[PDB]
Structure formats: C-alpha cells, structure tokens
Paper text:
They are activated by cGMP or cAMP, which bind to the cyclic nucleotide-binding domain (CNBD) to open a gate located 50-60 Å away in the central cavity. Here, we report structures of the cGMP-activated human cone photoreceptor CNGA3/CNGB3 channel in closed, intermediate, pre-open and open states in detergent or lipid nanodisc, all with fully bound cGMP. In eukaryotic CNG channels, the main activation gate is located in the central cavity and is formed by two hydrophobic amino acids in S6 (the cavity gate).
In the closed state and intermediate state 1, R410 of A3 and R456 of B3 are the only amino acids on the gating ring (i.e., helices A’B’) that interact with the TMD, mainly D289 and E292 on S4. In ND_cGMP_closed and ND_cGMP_intermediate, R442 projects to the ion conduction pathway with up and down orientations, as in GDN. In ND_cGMP_closed, R442 interacts with V396 of A3R in the up orientation but with S404 of A3L in the down orientation.
Numbering used by the authors:
A (entry chain B): 159 to 261, 270 to 611
B (entry chain C): 158 to 611
C (entry chain A): 159 to 260, 268 to 614
D (entry chain D): 206 to 646
The structure:
Amino acid sequence: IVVDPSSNLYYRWLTAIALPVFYNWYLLICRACFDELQSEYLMLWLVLDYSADVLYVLDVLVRARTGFLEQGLMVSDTNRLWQHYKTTTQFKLDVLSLVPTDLYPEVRFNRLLKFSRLFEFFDRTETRTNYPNMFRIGNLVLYILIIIHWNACIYFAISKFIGFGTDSWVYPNISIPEHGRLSRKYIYSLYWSTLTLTTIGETPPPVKDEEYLFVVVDFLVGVLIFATIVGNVGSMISNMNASRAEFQAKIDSIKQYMQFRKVTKDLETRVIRWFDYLWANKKTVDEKEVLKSLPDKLKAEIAINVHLDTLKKVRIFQDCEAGLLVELVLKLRPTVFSPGDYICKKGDIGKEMYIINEGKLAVVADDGVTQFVVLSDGSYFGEISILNIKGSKSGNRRTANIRSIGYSDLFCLSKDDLMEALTEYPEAKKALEEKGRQILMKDNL
Amino acid sequence: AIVVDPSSNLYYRWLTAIALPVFYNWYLLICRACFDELQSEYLMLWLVLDYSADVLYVLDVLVRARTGFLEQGLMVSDTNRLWQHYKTTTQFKLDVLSLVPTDLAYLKVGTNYPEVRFNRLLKFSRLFEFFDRTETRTNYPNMFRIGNLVLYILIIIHWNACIYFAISKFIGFGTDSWVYPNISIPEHGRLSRKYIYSLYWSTLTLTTIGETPPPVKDEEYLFVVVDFLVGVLIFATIVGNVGSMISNMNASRAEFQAKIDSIKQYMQFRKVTKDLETRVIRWFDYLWANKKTVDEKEVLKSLPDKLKAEIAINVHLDTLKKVRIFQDCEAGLLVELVLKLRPTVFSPGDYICKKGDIGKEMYIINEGKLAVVADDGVTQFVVLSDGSYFGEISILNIKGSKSGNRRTANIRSIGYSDLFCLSKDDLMEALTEYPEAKKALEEKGRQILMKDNL
Amino acid sequence: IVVDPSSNLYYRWLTAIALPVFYNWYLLICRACFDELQSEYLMLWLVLDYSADVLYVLDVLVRARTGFLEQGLMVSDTNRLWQHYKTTTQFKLDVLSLVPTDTNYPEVRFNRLLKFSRLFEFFDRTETRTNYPNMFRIGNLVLYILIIIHWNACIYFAISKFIGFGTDSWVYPNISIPEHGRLSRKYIYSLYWSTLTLTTIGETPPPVKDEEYLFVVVDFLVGVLIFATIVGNVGSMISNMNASRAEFQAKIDSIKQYMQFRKVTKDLETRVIRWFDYLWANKKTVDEKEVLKSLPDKLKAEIAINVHLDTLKKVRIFQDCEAGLLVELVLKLRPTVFSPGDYICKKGDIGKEMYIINEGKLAVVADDGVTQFVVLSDGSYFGEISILNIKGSKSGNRRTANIRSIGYSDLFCLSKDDLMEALTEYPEAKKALEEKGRQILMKDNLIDE
Amino acid sequence: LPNSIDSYTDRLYLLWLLLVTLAYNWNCCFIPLRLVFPYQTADNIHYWLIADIICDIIYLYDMLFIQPRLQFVRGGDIIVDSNELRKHYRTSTKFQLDVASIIPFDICYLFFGFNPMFRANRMLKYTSFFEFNHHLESIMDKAYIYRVIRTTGYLLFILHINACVYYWASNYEGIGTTRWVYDGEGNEYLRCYYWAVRTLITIGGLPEPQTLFEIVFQLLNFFSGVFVFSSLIGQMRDVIGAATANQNYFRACMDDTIAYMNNYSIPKLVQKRVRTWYEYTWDSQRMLDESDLLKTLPTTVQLALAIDVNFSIISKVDLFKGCDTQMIYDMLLRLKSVLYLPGDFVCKKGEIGKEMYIIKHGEVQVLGGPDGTKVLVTLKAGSVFGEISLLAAGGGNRRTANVVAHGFANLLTLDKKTLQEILVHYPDSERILMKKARVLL
Ligand SMILES: Nc1nc2c(ncn2[C@@H]2O[C@@H]3COP(=O)(O)O[C@H]3[C@H]2O)c(=O)[nH]1
Ligand SMILES: Nc1nc2c(ncn2[C@@H]2O[C@@H]3COP(=O)(O)O[C@H]3[C@H]2O)c(=O)[nH]1
Ligand SMILES: Nc1nc2c(ncn2[C@@H]2O[C@@H]3COP(=O)(O)O[C@H]3[C@H]2O)c(=O)[nH]1
Ligand SMILES: Nc1nc2c(ncn2[C@@H]2O[C@@H]3COP(=O)(O)O[C@H]3[C@H]2O)c(=O)[nH]1
Ligand SMILES: *[C@@H]1O[C@H](CO)[C@@H](O)[C@H](O)[C@H]1NC(C)=O
Ligand SMILES: *[C@@H]1O[C@H](CO)[C@@H](O)[C@H](O)[C@H]1NC(C)=O
Ligand SMILES: *[C@@H]1O[C@H](CO)[C@@H](O)[C@H](O)[C@H]1NC(C)=O
C-alpha cells in the first residue's frame, strides 16, 4: 500500500507519531535528570519505551511507503518511494533515532531526533483546524512548557552535580524527608525554572561561579522567551482583528470624505447604516477582490455553481450555448441595494439587466408608494433593453419604477458585458437578437 | 405585536441593560462564593440584586423571543416564526439553563451558598454582543478597546483573587506563610482587607511581578506555577493589545509619512530641484493638515454603485447644473456627467491651462481661486472663484470654429484650488446613449459661438 | 589594485576588520575597568593590541583603495579614491582611532572604539548576504545585549571600586577576602548584577547612598528602554515572518466565507479547500505576475527563456521564428494551474489559447468516459491552430477533442490576442505563421474560401 | 517682528515654539514638585517666583505678539492680512486654551498663601507642545529618533508624577511610620524616584505595603506600571516596524523572486544578475518601482515631477520640436524607467526597434567597430538615442549598431505602441511626426 501526505490517514498517523515524540522529549529529560522517576516506575517506562520504539519503526515503514508528487501525479511504486525516502536526511535522522543504544536513560537521547514529526503535526494541525489562533496559543504554551520543564531538569541535575544542601542556591538536602519526595523535587524545580524563565527571579541567589553563570544564561534565555511570547501573541492579535481594522479604516476614510465634501446628514446616515448592515451581516469583503486569487478554472466552476441554474431560467438564454452561459456568468456582477433604493426609474437609459437573488423588489407607480406587482426571488427585469434591437418601440428606456422593499442582491448583466460576451459567439448573438425581436413583436413593437 | 429591530437603538439600550446584570453576576457571584462574608453581611442587598438580575434575565428571554431577522432582505415580524427561530437555537438552551431555579437549594442551604447560582454565568453572549455593538457603534474605538481589555483582565484578576482566597481557606488561614493570614487577627479579619490583599496577590501573580510570599507546600507550588504561566500569557495579551492600539492609532499618519519619505527619496534620486521639492512637500503637508489627503476614487471604491452615484449627485449635481451648456439636459445625462467628474488639486502659481493648448477638459472650480493671467506672468484680468467654470466650449468641438479647441487664455491658480475635471472623452462616452442631448449640446455651443465669434 | 565594495574580497576584509573592533570594545572596557585582566595577561594583550592596530592600519589602507560607483561604473583612479576618502568624516574617525596614544592604564586606547562603522557595515553586509536574515537579526540583537550587559558590568565594577570595596551593601564585596578577590568571580558577579539590573528584574542588594541610588535609577531606566526596544524588534521580526502566512490565511478565510455564504456545494467546496491546501503545501502561494512585476523586461525575458524557450522552439509553427519574436512570445506566456480531472478544453469550446505544458501530464480523452487517446507530457503543446485561425478552416476556432488534467498541471497559455500583439513588429513572420498553419490545415482538413 | 509668520519655513517660529514648550514643561514638572515636596521654602521663594513670572511672560507674549501673526489657509488662498490673522486667532480654539491657561489665579496668593495648585491651569497650554512636536517632526529627517526621545520623556514624566504621588502618600501616612512609606533618610526626590521606577517599571524589591491605603496604592501603581510598560513596548514596536517597513518589503519581494527562480531551476548566472539588479535598485532608488509610487500622486504633481526631470531632455530632441507641449507632456507622463546591468545590450545589431531611449544617470556605448566591439560614441547621461524608431510602421526600423551599457545605465523608455496611443489624441503633432518620418527616412 502507498499513503499520500494530503489525506486523513496521514494526519492520523502524524498524531500517532507526535504522541511518542512529545513523550520522549518530556519524560526522557525528566527520567534522566531526576533519578527516582526512572527507578520507581521502571515497568511503566519499559512499556512506554517499547510502545515508542514500535511507533518509531512503524514511522520508518510509513515514511518508506509515503508518496510524493512528480509531474503533478502521486508516485506509487515502492522502489522509487524507498529510494527517495533513503536519499533524504530524514532517513538518517530516523535510523539515528532508532539505533540500539539500550544494549542511565541518557543513552536514549537519540530518540529526540524525530522532532520533525512533531513539527509536521503542528504545521498540519495549524493548516487543518478552524481555530488557528487558539491552536497557536496552544503550541506556544506547549513550547514554553517544554522549555520550563527542561530548565527544571537542568537545574535539578546541576544541583545534584554540585551537591544537595551544600549551598543556598542548589536544591535542599534530600535526606530530609520533606525535600526527599519526588513530587516535591519536581514541583520545586518547576517553580524555580518558572521564576527564572519568566524573569521574576524570587529564587535564592547564587553563591558560586557556575551558579552565577547558569543564572545569567537562564535569565537571558528567559528574556528571549518573553520576547518571543510577546511577539507571537502580538502578531496573533494583529491578525485576529486585521479585517476589523481594515473595515474601520475604510469607514473612517469614507466618513472623513463625507465630512470634507459636505454630504448631507440623510445620505451620511444612509452610508453609515449601509456599513452597519455590511458589518452586522458579515459582508465586509467584496467578491470582486475575493475571487482574484482563485484560478480561472475554479472561478468558472464557482460562477457555474452559483449562477448557472439562475441564468438558465432566463427566457432569452433558454437555448444558448453552454460556453456562452459560462462567459455570461463570468461577466455577471452582483450588487446589493438598500431598502427604498430605485433600481431603475421610468425614462432612464436601460443598459443593465438585473436578475433577482435573495431579494424582493416592487414595481411602484410613478414615484409613489402604491405597488403594481411585487417581484420575488429568481425573477428578472431589463431583458430586452440591453439587446439593442433595431426598431424598438421603447428605445432602451425603462417604462416602470422599480423600488427595493428590502435588502436585495441582484445580478447585473450589462449591455457592454453582453456585447463583449457575444463577440466570440456570433450565431448565438443572432439567435439572441432573434429571440428579443420575437418577444418585442409579441408584446409591443 | 411589537418586534424589536436588532439594528435599532432600542436593541442597543437593551444590550446595555442586559450587559449590566451579566457582569454583576460574574463578578459578585465569584466574590460571594469565595469570600463568605459578603454573602452573610449584605444578604438583603444580594437578594435585591439577584431578584433584579433574574427579572432582567426573563425579560431578556422575552426580548430574544421577539427580535427579527433578515430573510429575503425584510425583517420577519410574526411572533410565531420568531419564537420557533429562537427555539431552534442553542441560545434558547443557554437562556433556559441560566434561568434554572436553583434558588430552592439556595434557600435550603440557608442563603449561604451562592454557588448554586453559577449557571447565571451562561449569558456571556449578551456581554460579548454588547461589547461588539459598542466597538462598532462608538466614536472612540481604541479607548473602548482599552476599556474592554481592562475589564477582561480585571475579571480574570478578580476570579484569581477569589480562587486564591478559597485555596487559602481550604488549606488553612495563617497556618503557612503563603496562604492568607490568620483571620482571627482583627487587622486580617476585615472584609475590605481580605478582598484588597487577595486582589493585590492576584495582580502580583497574574502580571508576573511576584512580590508575594513563596509557597511552602506542593499544592501551593503547583497553583503558583500555573498562576505564573497564566500571568505571562495575560501579560503577553496586554502588551499585544496595547501595541495593536498604538499601531492602529497612527496607521494613517504612518501611511502619510511613508508616502512623504517615498516622494522625498524619489526627488533625491531623480535630482528634482529644491524649489519644486519644497513645493511638493508643502502641498502634501497642506493636503494632510486640511484633511483632504485621501484619494476620492480609492476611498469610494468600497461603496456600491448606487451609493457612489448618490454621493456624486449630492456633491456635484447642483454645481454641474449651473453650467450654461448643461442647463437643459437629461437627468440621467447629468448623473453620468457627475459620475465622470474627476477631482484635481492645484498649488499656488500652478498653470491650469495655457494659451494655444488643446482643450480636452472642462474644469469646474470648487474651494479655489483662479486667475486669467496674461502671457507674460501674473497680471490678473478676471479672478475666477468658487462655483465658476471654464473650458466648456472647447471640449464641445463645434464644427467650423475659428478658435477650434484652443485655450483662449492663460489660467493660473492663486491659492490651493480643488477643481472638477470633465474630460472630452468622458463627455463623449457619457453622450453615447443620448444622441438628442449630444445634438442639443452641439447646437447650444454653436449658438454661443455664433453670438460671440463664428 | 582597487577593492570593489560589492565583491567577496571586501566582505572577507569586513570580517577581518570586524573581529578586532569587537575585540577592542569588549576587552578594552573589561581591561580598563577590572585592573587584573590588564595586569596578569599583559603579553597576551600586547600581542592582541599589536594585531588589532596592524589591522586598523591595513583598514585605513584598504579604505584608501575602495572604489565607489559614479555614473554606474566603478571608479578605479587611486588619486580620486584617496581624495574622496580624505573628504570624508570616516577618514577623521579612522585617523583618530589610529593616534599613537600608547601600561596599566588601557583607557588611553579608548580611541580604538571609533571604528564602530566597520562592525556595523559587517553586520549590514552579512544580513544582506545571508539566507537566514531573521536568524541573523536574532544573533545581532543577542550580541548587542551582550555588549551592553558587559559594559554595564564594567561600569558597575568601576563604580564599586570608586566608592570602596565592601564599604556598602550595594557595592562589590571586599576584594581582600579570598572568595571575592578572584578575577573570575569579579567579572561573573558584575555580569550577574548587570543582567539583573538591565533586564529589570532587580533581585540584587538595594542601594544605600545617593550616588548608588542615582546610578541604579539611571541603570534601570536604560535597561527598561533597551529591553522594550529589544522586545519591539523581536515582535516586528515575528510579525514580518508570519506576514505571508497571515495574508494567505486571510485569503483562505475570505474565500471560505464567500463559498459558505453563496451556498456553494460541498464537492466544489472540498475542491477549493484541497487546491488551497496544495498551494501552501507546495509554497506556490505567490503569483508569477506579482513576483515578476517590478523586474525589467530584460531580466524577465532571461527568466522566461530559461524555462519556456526550449519548449517554444519545439512548436511546429515556432520552429524557425526570429529570436526576438520568441522572446516576445515567452514574455506573453501566462501560467495556469489545473486540478486533477479539470478539463482544459472540451469539444465545442471557443479556441483562443495555446497551452504549453510545464510539469504536468494531460490526456486527450473522449466524450463519454476516461479513455486517454494521447497522454500529453511535459514539453508538449496543443492549440496552435486555434490561435492561428487560418482562413478557410472547417474547425472555426473550435477544439477537436477533449483534454483534461490527470494531475496538477502548470500550463502556460499564449492567447490569440497576445500572439497578434507580439506579431505587430514581425509581419513576414506572421505571414510565415499563417502559411505554416495553412499547410497543416491543408494536409489535415481545409476548405478553400 | 514680521507682520506674518509662515509657520512652515520660519525657524524663528520653531525656536519660539521650543521656548513655549520649555515653559510648559517647566510648569508641568515643577507644579507637582513644589506642590508635594518641601522645596518651596521661604528662603527660596524668590527664584520660584522669578521662574513663574518668566513662564507667564512667555505665555503672554505667545498669546499677544506671535500667535496673532500666524499665516493660515482659508478656502485655498493664503491669508496675509494681519487683521484677518488676528480674528482667526481670536475665534480659534487655541485662544480659549491660552486664555484659560493665563487666567491669573496667582492673585489668590494673598488669600490662601503660596500654593502651586493655583498655577495648575498653566498646564492647559499643551497645544504649543503638540505643534512643537509636529514642527520638529516635519523639519527632522528621521523622526523616529524624536519619537523615541518623546517616549523616553513621557516615561520620565510619568515616573516623576509617580514619585510626587508617592511622596504625598508618605507625608499623608506619616514619614517613617510604616515600612512602605518614605523614611526621610537621603534625597527625598531621588529616593521617591527610585521607588517610582521600581514600582511603575514593575521591578519590585521594595518593602511590602503594610496598611490598606498602601496596599491599594501599590496595587493601582503596579497595574498602571503594567500598562505603562506595555505602551512603551508598543511604541518601540511601532517605531521599529515603521522604520524598517520599506526595507522589509524590498526583502520580501526579493525573497519572492529568489524562491521563484529556485522553484523553476533558473541558473546561477541569471540569479546573480537578478540579485545584482535588486541590490543596485535598493542602493540607488531605495524603492522597487517608481511607477507604483507616481501613479498614487495626483496628475498635477505627476506632471510637475515629470517636467522637472525630463522636459529639457525631450525639448532638446530634434524629432519632437514641432510637436505640441501637451503631447510632449503626455509622453513625459508615459515614460518607463528601466535599469540595465553592466554589459547589457540595449540595442542589438539586427533586432527590432520599438522604443526611444532617454539615458539618465548612466553610460551606454555604441559598438560599431570592424569586429563589433570598438566604441564609437559613449553616450553619457541626458542623451536620447533611437528616437527615429518611434515612427516606423509595422516591422520597419531594425537596429543598425550594437549599443551596450558600460556601467549600470538607467534608461528611460517610450514604446512605439505607447507613442501611438498618445498620438490618437493629438492629430496635428501626429501629422508633423509622419511628415518628419517621411522627410528623414
Ligand atoms: N413595463 C413593465 N415592466 C414590468 C412590469 N412588471 C415587471 N416589469 C419589468 O419592469 C421593467 C423596468 O425596466 P425595463 O424597461 O428594463 O423592463 C420592464 C420589465 O422587465 C410591468 O407590469 N410593466
Ligand atoms: N478668453 C477668456 N476666457 C475666459 C474669461 N473669463 C473666463 N474665461 C474662461 O477662460 C478660458 C480658458 O480656456 P478656454 O479657451 O477653454 O475658454 C476660456 C473661458 O471659458 C475671459 O475674460 N476671457
Ligand atoms: N484532435 C486532436 N488534437 C490533438 C491530438 N493530440 C494532441 N492534440 C491537440 O489537442 C487539441 C485540443 O485543442 P485543439 O482543437 O485546439 O487542437 C488539438 C491538438 O492540438 C489528437 O490525437 N487529436
Ligand atoms: N549607428 C550609430 N547609431 C548611433 C551613433 N551615435 C548615436 N547613435 C544612435 O544609436 C542607434 C542605436 O539604434 P538605432 O539603430 O535605432 O539607431 C542608431 C542611432 O540613432 C553612431 O555613431 N552610430
Ligand atoms: C543532609 O542530611 C544528612 C542527615 O540528615 C546529613 O548527614 C548531611 O550532612 C546533610 N547534607 C548537607 C549537605 O548538609
Ligand atoms: C489565629 O488566632 C487565634 C487567636 O488569636 C488562635 O486561636 C488560632 O490558633 C490562630 N490560628 C492559627 C492558624 O495560628
Ligand atoms: C577588607 O578586608 C581587609 C582584611 O580582611 C580589612 O583590613 C579591610 O578593612 C576590609 N575592608 C572593609 C571595607 O571592610
């Protein structure tokens, strides 16, 4: 079998191999430095180390049968997969992490060489999850807890090397039953390392030169840790409200424009209420900028999936070419209208055709509140004035006032957009002109 | 009957009136749960405030049963459909869980355990909604962001003070050096002293100052290391929030200063003369200081076409209607013409147009002062002022004109002008759907030039 | 000989002159303030100061022969280089750092610290030349704070010696005690005090006199300011490190919100999510027209002919074209990335683009099922006749068969309008292209119109 | 004194704003110091009164003889008439703050004795400090240095105010009563400033608060110190991120180009040439493109910056001598700046010709020797070559000689297509150009 790195089985294996790597780092430095975790829970550490080595050789096999991409296609032959896995330095890191050094748990510090699986699990979870900033604070707390734990183990090893209870800086005398417990040892070492790496420093001061030097190095490392934590959380907060700051900057610039150009209070509060609607309905980003980073094939497929069943129900586009409808939904433009907004007044130049989506319009009667007919979802208007038929009775002029009752979302197919969409389909252009001429001869010509 | 608009002002008044007792419930419920003297000494006050909070909670579920929502762009106004749309939400479950009558157990324990009212903290969504509506509604966004961050970290510091006092009560008062001192001492037994020292300890721990006594037991060591890591996280979010405030407060000023440094580097690299360099720099400083530095086309790009047309009407239509050739034109033609108007700014002494130049623009003066100077320099013949216009005959291109499209006079700027430019090509693109109006404009220009010189 | 300031020999000399500058700063302040480091290792400091002064003299001699760009070309006239050096303030700083001021008082050698510009130039050139600029910025910040901690240690020891050893609880302890009298403990306790003061921790003994109070206030203020700037620099570096990831995630979340609001079906939603996961996974997040936007056409043409020219020369109509026409045609190419199963062009579609296959495998499939007639590979092409549009074609700008992607293809499109734009300066080559297309259409299928 | 102060090109006005800033900073510093500390003794009161009279005299001179002479812009035109300047100052909002600052509450010294709380309205003249900051940032080249100095001064002022409030709390609780209050040993201001530094920088290490007033004081001071340190870090981060934004943008686009050329396996000679282009562009221009900078400016300043750079150069060209000034201006605005590396061919002998080259800050060499490498003419900066190739139709003009760049030549290019799209609006100069092409070719 061949696994591929983009599937879900690969991410489940990334979790299943990120568990024993974190176990190896954490509990290997703890057992190497504390000497009672290793002594008391010996069968538990034997079981967990056997499980970690089993998952390590299984990771070697999975990396041996993990595919890659050449010429866009996934490679699936195990010989070339094995050679490509072998020529990489990750193969040497895996073999060096699986040397039989068990033939004092510090000999198992080769097992810490599989850190790339933990970093790959963190990267894949960060790109897969839907709470990326919550996972980022989780990863930051995990990294700084690893450093706090490793510094606690280093402090206990240094105080054991100097001597227990010989100094005021080192760990107290473990022959006393209060300082002799493993829980007291680990939690006091963790408290010391936390005070020293959070640059609080309420610890007893050093008395020897190696202790002074270790405390200097520890306080500078804690300074770098605090700077990294603050930088990551600050960039995360700057990313968490970048869209809010962009929309507030746009609102502030438009309000400054409306104050500088002396826009009246009615239009000013109409613009303010429009932006309040645009934020309270989460429409803060425009689709014309949203659909630029996509390729043309996915843009065309999204335009089909949104507008093709709507455009196919238009009476002039019932028997047109599928490629012509593809170009037409590529040239569709969506606009949102406020309540009471006139889409078109009677007597204006008709150069756009609007198809209603998720809205409710009304044909009002000569700048009045009385409505003749109420248009609804899926319907359209302006289907004839944009075709530019010779000998029209109307002459590209709207014969009715259409107001918006609520917030409508129309799709605007312009005259120029239809003319540049009809330039590579001339037979479809003549058929569209024939259908418009037929509709005009039926109703009024 | 009555349906409250969620975008109105009455909804924000109710958001304030329901964000008061939620914050009260959080703060004083953890305080009365962990401090044990606030509950006993002020029992009538807490009965009054809990009854008022429960009244506001049932009024909130009655309000949430009657807020409209947007489908098909219209506000839903039938109480039955509003009630089913509320009942099919998790917020209805959170509200009926926040209104669970645990006051029977509160009366069974003798009104000494306010821990049964901890389900009242399940209406945090009203507090977050009030903060969101205020941060999009108010005129002081950075000041509100600082107040919101201060409120959040004070809730956390207060909860950690209550947790520290509960841990000290569980371990023993005054039995250790880390726990709260012996409350039988009359100085340590005051409730103000208890709360203020617990809040002081919690602030020192959660802000990574740590001027506190050191732990002496394993649970105290573990609580202190967990509190110190939570405190370094809290300090990181405080520094990041204030840094984002500072970065957002002068973002426009930093953008203008980056523009100024870019133009200065261009004028140093291209060896632009010093007089024009100071002219351009003083021009941009004027545009900043008089609050007109932004580009109108880039500012109005985020608006829809209907609001852009309405703003262009409200700014330029009453000024374009005073032009003599556009006196009797179609309303849609004037709307397209004020949409085609592009603005330009001018410096003192800047030439708008010189004599013998090809006329392709029609300028309309707005907040400026121009001057029809001679060809030698600055000798004002006519001082052109606000509301006036020029260049309206040369862009019409009247056939058989003895002046053609040439500028008959030199026009300089005296101060800082803000003209509105209508291009000849933009006029011809706006006159494609109006052939009758194009012929009328041509005939009016022909009549004016026949009155003057044809 | 003229040393080119953009060469590699100049960077080798920047290393060889930034070594004694860092030596001079660090060990000159330590020897000046500790009075035993100068006294014990005296021959070592004589050797190192002789080497540093010889390197300073050679630095003046190298700066006297370093070129500069005037009107785009490097000046090689040694007299012009010498006068241009002489009219600089760096010449004054170098000759002030080379005055013969020269045993137990190495504070007469403090003019040697005036060559800080060579250390700053070395750091700037290393950050320019490296491939890990944020890692070098972290290293440079660490070196700056180490220099500051060391200088504050020397200042604290000098202040303690001026006040009196062991006369206060704040000053350095009595050096007549054999524990405190060691040079290692002197330097290491001064470094410990300086770390605890400049990092604004403050767990050292508090001052007892007014001069000590004033020095500790000034030292805490210098440390707070410096550390705040350090934390702001690290934060700006982190925010500019994850800026591309933040922009790509903003684009992903915007398109996800659009697809959720417009009720796009789950199959197309999964396809767009998989394409975005492939993009970042392949770090192909940037766009070609965005990353080659500011380059000149000469360098864009060199970049384009190092990838596309060997494929464009194999095209049956672009066999014997002109070199300049092939340059224009490889500059007119536009990349298009396709998903697996994406149809490039179907039967009946409008033909206006010629696709060039680069790192992909296409298949000319039939209409009903996936029956691959020809498997088009890397270096191949299709669609030249549709962009030629020869008069009298029965096709009429329509593709014959269907072509879909088997895997992720990066096709490069030469459209018909771009071909006619590149053929404005080559009318004979346009006529030859039309003749070759008419010959191909004559041997395949063509009406005479 | 002049009748009108420019307030932009007047350095005497910057010095006067410095004097009013020094008076305002003297007031803000020495009103709480004299209010709290016992430094306003009866044997020292005359020097304090002399300094307060000097500060009030500076305030009065600013209110009366300088600010009414400030030029301003009303509706675009610059106002010079002193009557209009005086009414604009009198009806301003600065005059309200100046009057409310210079309100003589010093006459209450006869009633309530010498007390600097009556001078506390003199801290309402902050607008002069703010315009001094604005004018100093405008005259300074690198204003982040003054931003850092201002942030340092704000930190020192808030620590000074904290030292004054701590000495007030020590005098209120009693000096030397508890362990937390000031004991009275050495310099009162220096030791209270030490306490303020260690508290508002959240260093600690001081005696613990004993009573409830001291615990509340220490808690509020530590919270304020957390926010002061956070604002200090945020200000330094804003200064650093604004100071290095252009350099980091240039490095980001250079890394994007390098990642592209590494993804497409482009050779190391081409990668070295691209890196040389990026390095010389950062050395000379300190920006990637001038076109996306100039396209953000208005058309009038675009035309002025194009004229002042290239108008004499194109007016020396014989081909566009009969053409008209507006078409020449459009061809000025539509020029393109390209940078050639040393040894780059700008015109290969035999290739097509479609551009006119304006060489600015460079040197190109026309190779027309017998082998093809001998230099005939070395065209220095400000020259124009290949201008007759702008008028040929179709293929037309082929290049007749190899022209290479000697060093880094920064040519300016006008395309034939660009000249045609300019010429579709200017028919008379179009006829002159075709007649010149017919008589020359
Ligand atoms: N004239 C007219 N148009 C109607 C009516 N009901 C819906 N409409 C649409 O309203 C329109 C307004 O613009 P159009 O002239 O473009 O075309 C018209 C029709 O599509 C009706 O009763 N009369
Ligand atoms: N010739 C002229 N033009 C004037 C005068 N007052 C205002 N104007 C406008 O100034 C102009 C400058 O450009 P135009 O030739 O286009 O047209 C001219 C008029 O519209 C005046 O007294 N003479
Ligand atoms: N019809 C056809 N086209 C092929 C074949 N092999 C490669 N191609 C290319 O596939 C094409 C698809 O588009 P075109 O019609 O534009 O032109 C066709 C050819 O250039 C083949 O066997 N048949
Ligand atoms: N051949 C040639 N061209 C020169 C010389 N001096 C300047 N030039 C210009 O250099 C040119 C390079 O391009 P062109 O062939 O287009 O035309 C040539 C001339 O306009 C010279 O001595 N010989
Ligand atoms: C630790 O305690 C034991 C007995 O309790 C004692 O013998 C030993 O000396 C002590 N160690 C130190 C370093 O004091
Ligand atoms: C607290 O004080 C009371 C009386 O002062 C005493 O009885 C009690 O034991 C004290 N508690 C502790 C823990 O010391
Ligand atoms: C330092 O020690 C010496 C000898 O131990 C002693 O004479 C001297 O007084 C000490 N100095 C101080 C300041 O105590």
